[PDB]
Amino acid sequence: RDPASDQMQHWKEQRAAQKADVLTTGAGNPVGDKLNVITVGPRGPLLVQDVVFTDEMAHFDRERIPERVVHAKGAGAFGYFEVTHDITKYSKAKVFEHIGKKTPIAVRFSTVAGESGSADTVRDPRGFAVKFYTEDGNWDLVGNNTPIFFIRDPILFPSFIHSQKRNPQTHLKDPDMVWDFWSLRPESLHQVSFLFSDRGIPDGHRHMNGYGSHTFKLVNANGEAVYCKFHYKTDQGIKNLSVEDAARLSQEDPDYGIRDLFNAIATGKYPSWTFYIQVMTFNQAETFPFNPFDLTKVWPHKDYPLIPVGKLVLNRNPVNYFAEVEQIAFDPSNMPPGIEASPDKMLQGRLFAYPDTHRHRLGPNYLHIPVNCPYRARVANYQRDGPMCMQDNQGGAPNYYPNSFGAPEQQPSALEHSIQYSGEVRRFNTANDDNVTQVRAFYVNVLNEEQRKRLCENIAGHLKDAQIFIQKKAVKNFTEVHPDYGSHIQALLDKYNA
Amino acid sequence: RDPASDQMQHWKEQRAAQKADVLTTGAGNPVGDKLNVITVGPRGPLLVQDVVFTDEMAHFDRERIPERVVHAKGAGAFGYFEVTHDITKYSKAKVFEHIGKKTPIAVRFSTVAGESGSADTVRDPRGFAVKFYTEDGNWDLVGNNTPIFFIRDPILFPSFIHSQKRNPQTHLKDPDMVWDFWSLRPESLHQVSFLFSDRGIPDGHRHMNGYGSHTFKLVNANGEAVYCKFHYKTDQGIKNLSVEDAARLSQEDPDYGIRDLFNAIATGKYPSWTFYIQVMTFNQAETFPFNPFDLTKVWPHKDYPLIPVGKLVLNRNPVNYFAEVEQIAFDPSNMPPGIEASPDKMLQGRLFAYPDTHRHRLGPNYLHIPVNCPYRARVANYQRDGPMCMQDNQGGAPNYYPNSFGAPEQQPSALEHSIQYSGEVRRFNTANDDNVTQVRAFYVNVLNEEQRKRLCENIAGHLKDAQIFIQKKAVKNFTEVHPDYGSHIQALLDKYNA
Amino acid sequence: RDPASDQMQHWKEQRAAQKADVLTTGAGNPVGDKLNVITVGPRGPLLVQDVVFTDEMAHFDRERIPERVVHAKGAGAFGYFEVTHDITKYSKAKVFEHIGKKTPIAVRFSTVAGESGSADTVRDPRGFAVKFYTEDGNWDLVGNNTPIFFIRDPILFPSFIHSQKRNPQTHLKDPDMVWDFWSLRPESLHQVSFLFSDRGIPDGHRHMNGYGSHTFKLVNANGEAVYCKFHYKTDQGIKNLSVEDAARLSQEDPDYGIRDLFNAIATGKYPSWTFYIQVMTFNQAETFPFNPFDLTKVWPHKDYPLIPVGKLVLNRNPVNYFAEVEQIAFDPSNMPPGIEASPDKMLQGRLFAYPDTHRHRLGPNYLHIPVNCPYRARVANYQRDGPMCMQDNQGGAPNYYPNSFGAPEQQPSALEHSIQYSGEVRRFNTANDDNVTQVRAFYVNVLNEEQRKRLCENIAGHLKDAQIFIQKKAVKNFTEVHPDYGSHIQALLDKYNA
Amino acid sequence: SRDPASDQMQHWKEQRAAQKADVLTTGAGNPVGDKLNVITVGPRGPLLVQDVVFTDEMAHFDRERIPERVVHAKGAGAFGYFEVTHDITKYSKAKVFEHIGKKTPIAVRFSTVAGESGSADTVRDPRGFAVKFYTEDGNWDLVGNNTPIFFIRDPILFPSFIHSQKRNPQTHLKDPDMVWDFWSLRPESLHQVSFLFSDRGIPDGHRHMNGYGSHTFKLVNANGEAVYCKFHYKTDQGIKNLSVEDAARLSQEDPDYGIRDLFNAIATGKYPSWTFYIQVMTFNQAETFPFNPFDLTKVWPHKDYPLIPVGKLVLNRNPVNYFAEVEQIAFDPSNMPPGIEASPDKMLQGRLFAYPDTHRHRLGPNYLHIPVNCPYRARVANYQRDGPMCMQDNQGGAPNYYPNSFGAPEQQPSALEHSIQYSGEVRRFNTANDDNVTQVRAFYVNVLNEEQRKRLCENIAGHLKDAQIFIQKKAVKNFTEVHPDYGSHIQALLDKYNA
Numbered sequence A, B, C: 001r002d003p004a005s006d007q008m009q010h011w012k013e014q015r016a017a018q019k020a021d022v023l024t025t026g027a028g029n030p031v032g033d034k035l036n037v038i039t040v041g042p043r044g045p046l047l048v049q050d051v052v053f054t055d056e057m058a059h060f061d062r063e064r065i066p067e068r069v070v071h072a073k074g075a076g077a078f079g080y081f082e083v084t085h086d087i088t089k090y091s092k093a094k095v096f097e098h099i100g101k102k103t104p105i106a107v108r109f110s111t112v113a114g115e116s117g118s119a120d121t122v123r124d125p126r127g128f129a130v131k132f133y134t135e136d137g138n139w140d141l142v143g144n145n146t147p148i149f150f151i152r153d154p155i156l157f158p159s160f161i162h163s164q165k166r167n168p169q170t171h172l173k174d175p176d177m178v179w180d181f182w183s184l185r186p187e188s189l190h191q192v193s194f195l196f197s198d199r200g201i202p203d204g205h206r207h208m209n210g211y212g213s214h215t216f217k218l219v220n221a222n223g224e225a226v227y228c229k230f231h232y233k234t235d236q237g238i239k240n241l242s243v244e245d246a247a248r249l250s251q252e253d254p255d256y257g258i259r260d261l262f263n264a265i266a267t268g269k270y271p272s273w274t275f276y277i278q279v280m281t282f283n284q285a286e287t288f289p290f291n292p293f294d295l296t297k298v299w300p301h302k303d304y305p306l307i308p309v310g311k312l313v314l315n316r317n318p319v320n321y322f323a324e325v326e327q328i329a330f331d332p333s334n335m336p337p338g339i340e341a342s343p344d345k346m347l348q349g350r351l352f353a354y355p356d357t358h359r360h361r362l363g364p365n366y367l368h369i370p371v372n373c374p375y376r377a378r379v380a381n382y383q384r385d386g387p388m389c390m391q392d393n394q395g396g397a398p399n400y401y402p403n404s405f406g407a408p409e410q411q412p413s414a415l416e417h418s419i420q421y422s423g424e425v426r427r428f429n430t431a432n433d434d435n436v437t438q439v440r441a442f443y444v445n446v447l448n449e450e451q452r453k454r455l456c457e458n459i460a461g462h463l464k465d466a467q468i469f470i471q472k473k474a475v476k477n478f479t480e481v482h483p484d485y486g487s488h489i490q491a492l493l494d495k496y497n498a
Numbered sequence D: 001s002r003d004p005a006s007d008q009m010q011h012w013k014e015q016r017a018a019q020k021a022d023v024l025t026t027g028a029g030n031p032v033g034d035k036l037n038v039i040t041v042g043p044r045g046p047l048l049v050q051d052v053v054f055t056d057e058m059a060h061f062d063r064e065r066i067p068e069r070v071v072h073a074k075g076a077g078a079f080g081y082f083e084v085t086h087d088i089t090k091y092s093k094a095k096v097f098e099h100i101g102k103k104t105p106i107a108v109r110f111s112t113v114a115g116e117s118g119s120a121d122t123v124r125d126p127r128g129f130a131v132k133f134y135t136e137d138g139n140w141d142l143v144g145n146n147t148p149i150f151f152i153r154d155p156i157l158f159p160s161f162i163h164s165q166k167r168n169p170q171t172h173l174k175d176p177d178m179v180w181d182f183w184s185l186r187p188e189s190l191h192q193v194s195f196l197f198s199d200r201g202i203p204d205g206h207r208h209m210n211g212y213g214s215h216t217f218k219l220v221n222a223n224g225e226a227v228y229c230k231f232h233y234k235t236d237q238g239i240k241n242l243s244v245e246d247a248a249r250l251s252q253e254d255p256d257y258g259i260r261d262l263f264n265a266i267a268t269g270k271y272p273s274w275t276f277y278i279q280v281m282t283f284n285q286a287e288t289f290p291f292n293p294f295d296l297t298k299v300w301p302h303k304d305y306p307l308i309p310v311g312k313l314v315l316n317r318n319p320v321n322y323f324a325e326v327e328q329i330a331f332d333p334s335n336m337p338p339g340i341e342a343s344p345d346k347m348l349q350g351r352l353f354a355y356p357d358t359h360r361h362r363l364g365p366n367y368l369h370i371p372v373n374c375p376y377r378a379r380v381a382n383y384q385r386d387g388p389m390c391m392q393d394n395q396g397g398a399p400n401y402y403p404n405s406f407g408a409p410e411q412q413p414s415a416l417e418h419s420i421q422y423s424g425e426v427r428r429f430n431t432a433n434d435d436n437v438t439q440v441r442a443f444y445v446n447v448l449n450e451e452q453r454k455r456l457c458e459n460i461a462g463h464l465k466d467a468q469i470f471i472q473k474k475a476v477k478n479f480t481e482v483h484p485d486y487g488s489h490i491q492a493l494l495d496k497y498n499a
């Protein structure tokens, strides 16, 4: 009797008021009997000329595409972003042009490590990907529910993902892998501390915040630029699940977040987020006491306050999930003029990985998929062909550039902003950037002892199943942040170890 | 110039009287400079943040799809099929519903053995596929320029195709392979004789006939059935290129068939074909002097004369060749009600092979591409998902059948025609059915002494390159068709063997 | 300190005393630093010439392949099959040739509806696939832990699967879908009663049986044929979990089946199964009160007793799960001489489905994958090419049959059995084919009073969520099996709809 | 009395010295009783699904084809070795150059450029000359051409140039407007177009042509010192070309002339060889070079940069299966062992991405598991896993994350990349107006005699004539800037054609 459990009945109401459609093959031929197969006699074998069977059976056999290598389990919704404040002094992006402008958006939430059948309510970072359909093209802000990440170099991302997933022989989640990587890489202390905090299991997707995480770049109409951070905080309030609640729910309803989001929109409780930016000038980036492009660190609110910008509103549920959610593609490199990448190593690597994996998971022409289409921008270029090529393939337009025959032209208004760099082209070590200073501020200044104990309990509940030498180096890293942090964990580890 | 050479100039005189479009990325983001790459300094290395380069380059790297395993080289056009005579007593198909009914058609000609770079004017059968967009879905008549073929059992087709293409080690056309298989399978004599006659290299595609080759089955409104052939003869006249003419044109213009057909439609010289059918009753099927479903045999006109039905007209050149011709897919299994298959073993195998290879060459959802979409029918079934799902995926419609929720329903007016078959289920040998009779009639009656000489010499020019024991068995088959036939070729071979 | 948790340390104890391997790219180039990405200066952007990063990131972007459309969540193991008795009177199959002959096997257990991330201890059928690498090629016996199935016609299979999986709009398991199809298809009664009994949730894969379910056909050396059923019963004893235990484990260890099997093998507690068959002669097939090819029916033991055959033993864990378990493919069409298919419409449908779905999920040459390779037979034929062709591609052997150059030859002894059938070619309706007779026997004779209580409880526990009109027609089906059956369920349903 | 290619099926059979035929099996190894007749219900009845033999063979026939190479689709392949003759360890520490007399297996694919899988070999086109070294430090792919230069000097123009070299997107026909509108708007193409439309446009097979790395590369020695090098391999068979008349004839008579020619030469023992040289430019001379030494449209003059010998390439083994060993072979310019790196050549930078990207598309994500692409002389050990058509053991139970405490593969600092300092703005620097004419004039006036200049002009005219007049005018102005005689001679011919 919930809106999700009645969707077939609601879809019906319209069909009772018509007749049914005629059942057809894929080629549109009417089917006379699709409940019984063609055989010679009632007890005879099946015949090849039963095309109706093979046509439907062969499409069933190809229903599955590869799930996302990460963030495989998720839920999608649609709505709009509305400007509420003028930040045209920082970014000339059309999406910020004037107060009151609405831009259609697509959103997909997710976990990270679990695959397409896992539970929603498990401890994991929560993906929060937003796709803005602007006139200067699509702007993908592929954020998640934390301002930081576990690593600061993108070449370590496949290893970290491997360590979070299944053992390659046993196919089991391996704590030895999980904490051997985290202990050997102490830059994860910051996001690990956030991961095992209360915010590690949000109460559905509507009660959590979202962050672009990376430092980005904004460019105004004068060609001047600043660096920035994208925040969108829930208007529904920060709400989490205790580990007792999510465990029950992980079995009771592994699709808790999907059901919650669909039911909420289906009854008009349209969720919303307030969209902010932090701004840091180039001079301020030269005097920041850390690397401003270090994904393990936040811009403190005192020195870089939140400037409000707008509002994210989700008011439409997907009609077909596979078409509109499973096949949606977010590319962090989808950035319209007035918004550019920073030299954040992690973001730099993301600029390659997403279109690369999307050409594998979906296909070379994945931007032709309806939800991925920049349907508010006029696409015209010199790319042609590819498997599953749709529309007119830009027809008979000349396919080489430059040309003398009227094909599209570049326009200097969309050219990037120039930055001077100097240095050797090599691999600079960032393993020993500051790993504990901002974490100590998190352990002492952000949490109460009620949250400190739950956090130390949350880590010890899972680290206990790793090897003792791993716990040694793990605790060693927590004591460098706070001796309270380590010894608190160490006592609880002494408990499970007996 | 000819309308083919001027196609870029004409596009300029239709579009380029306005401003030029905006050159964008795949995601629609405008591009300021698509002529120079992003580097650090004028002589510095390339940067990953030049995603404009990666967007265009990665799509270029993915343009190519597998060519057709056969008939890789061809040309496409579009037009209509119009009804001129009433054959509704034979077939209830909506395509012949009333005289004057027009149906949009898609057509693609082709050679057979050559790949995408081969020449048009070479000795080879000529594919002639026609796609009818009917209200009952698409009907694909995937014919060629001969009423017969080389074999009568589909299990030998992959080897015959292998024998006609490149040697697996040298990648060269091997005459040993061609005539070893042909001498070992004398059922090929009928189509080998047609291949080496003047028709083997028709003057383009407008000057050849088209045939469904196979015996088909027609069903009227009262359930009664008849067996039929599909003929469509050229209205522009039969015309053939000579050996020196085609050899020269293979050098001067490999794409002769493309250019000729394109320019004809472009100068309003629309080619056309007169549609016919032969009808054979089920009682006549039992009295037929051969297997009536034997693809190596014709139905003689004296005993089974042609019957007018309609006309085929091609009057629209493709706008983008890749999207409309290279991506087009014809399935002989695509038959609307009133048109069914016969027990032709060859056709029986083709029922599986085409939708099977199309899921590979194009993809599981290849019917979603525009030219293969049945855009005059209403596709409604319980198939969902698949790679590159292009439509709404039928929304939130119930995906299972039967169901109590108004989803599509089978209609019993589309049921197939039921007939009894007699015998054990078993591999029946057709290798030594009649191989020579209808070939002797082709040699003595269909040709004159001018055409026999030119045909015998055409065979000798290719058979001479195989080994002697291959020439021997080949002559043994030709001598078995007619003594003058075999001795004629043996005379030429002796000359070449010197 | 179970062997699963200590897999990495055990692997390192085999290192120990070996210097670790040099870390390379895909092309074998040694890597200097795989922990830091190339940039222009310590805080400059990323460079395309960091091929090491791209080489690794691009492969991580492609790790995932489509999961199985059904039976996605599974566990694999290896061992052997040993012949214990003499059934050469029935089957000339070399896999049964002598008592004591050992044939290697590979096995995969699985759930059905859950996808890759789902839990093991849920109510579902349990796939039990066995691949026999025989000297006559591979024999795939793709069974599950029940001798019957929900349907008896393969064209209903996509819809049954669709109704068991997620709603197309909400992406949630939909009880209306599950029971609308089940209520409208009473042929599901027999397997539904099994599914919701105690046997619906086995305590791991070692404590369940396996059945081929379908009728098969055995042929001996003298051409005599008989029909057959396959049975292999667990020597570890049938053991099932309560829904309370199963629901609890689905939160603790969703991989309960994988862990129990991996650790049982690794501690030498090899599970085993006793392989049986039931034999029905063709004369008994026509006298049989039921249709001996209806997948919803069993063969009663009193009239067709279990004939012992051999032993299945699993004594080796997989080394790489993805390479050995995820990529393994079973085709019921893989059958050596002495083992044939029956006119069982369901099996007839499966003959096409598995190779079809493996060419998509895995690739056209998925038989080249080692676990799918028939490494005890010599593959030699005229198939060539295909994407990712890995072996010698059969070198430079003549690729056409027949030929005169000593290529592989057919041998007539491997010919199939020839039956004569009778009747039209048409779709015969099998919806009302005795849907209750063997179900009432299951309720009355097989079960005690407790089992009936749990059965009706497990039924009403899930049917409670279907619409009232869906419950009525469902209770109608159960009451047709037995008035006590459907009234006990109805008595429970009213306590749920209150 | 027939070339070895013709007799290959006969030679295959007689290799079976009275062996007895292999048993015909399905894909899964099941013996086939009758692969000549399909299963029917009666002699005149319809086909049955339980004929698994027919479907198994047919469905694999339906999937034989893979996408062709987006460029260089038409070509031939051969295998052999590279032998070191001189000591260049002063310049590079590559194991393939380790000591004099050291041999390394090589695989080579020759190719044309524009035509697809069915085109003719003896047509005017650049010739691909890719060489794969299976060294103990992994594979070294040297993906070269038969010319030391190219048409453009920025990788972003390569798709547009290739498009303008292939078929018109509506008519599927070759288009002179497309071809000569791009070249005339991009006058950096002058240098390589002149080489194209000279006598070296249609070589007489693959054995009678040179090979070059074209790009400037970098060589690093054992001390960490680097230079800028050019790779050269010269035919030991002599420069030999086909006339326009004979090339036209052979394109019809024998479309696969080069494939056949190379195969018979190896099969009769006439193994072709190429002497491997290197040009060497220090970093000081790099700052003094009158052009951009990383400009792919320019060569280092031999008088100023002489050839230093290294060894010879030798092709002595034909492929056994063309599809598996030639059609499926994959060369990646980014396959470079230590002691060999890339220069900031913008064209080389784009190719670092394109080939492994296009190879994951054409062949599949795990294309390095294909044998002819396998670096079978080095032990692959990394933290990559799974993927479509995972072939070997997938590295077993080895830990799949780095760093790790369980003895999995480790980086070694001896393979670390050479470091160069760069300075400037990060932006798009224009190189369209670099020197486009200086070396083009040297080739027109000195490398060619009067007889070759006429054939050169007649080849440009015989093709450019089919373009529109306004394209001919801007094209001649480009040739005029090379030399007035150059532009005037072409204009003299074009006026004859256009009448």
Ligand code: HEM
Binding pocket: A061, C067, C068, C069, C070, C071, C074, C108, C109, C110, C126, C127, C128, C129, C142, C143, C144, C149, C153, C154, C155, C157, C211, C212, C213, C214, C328, C329, C330, C346, C347, C349, C350, C353, C354, C357, C358, C361
């Ligand atoms: C018309 C009926 C059926 C059809 C069309 C069908 C189809 C399929 C398909 C497409 C797969 C995926 C295979 C893969 O991707 O690896 C599969 C898996 C499987 N099926 Fe069915 N199925 C049917 C009924 C059955 C029956 C009757 C049984 C057993 C008696 C069964 C047992 C299994 C098992 C065990 C697997 C998993 C194989 C593995 O572990 O890799 N199925 N089926």
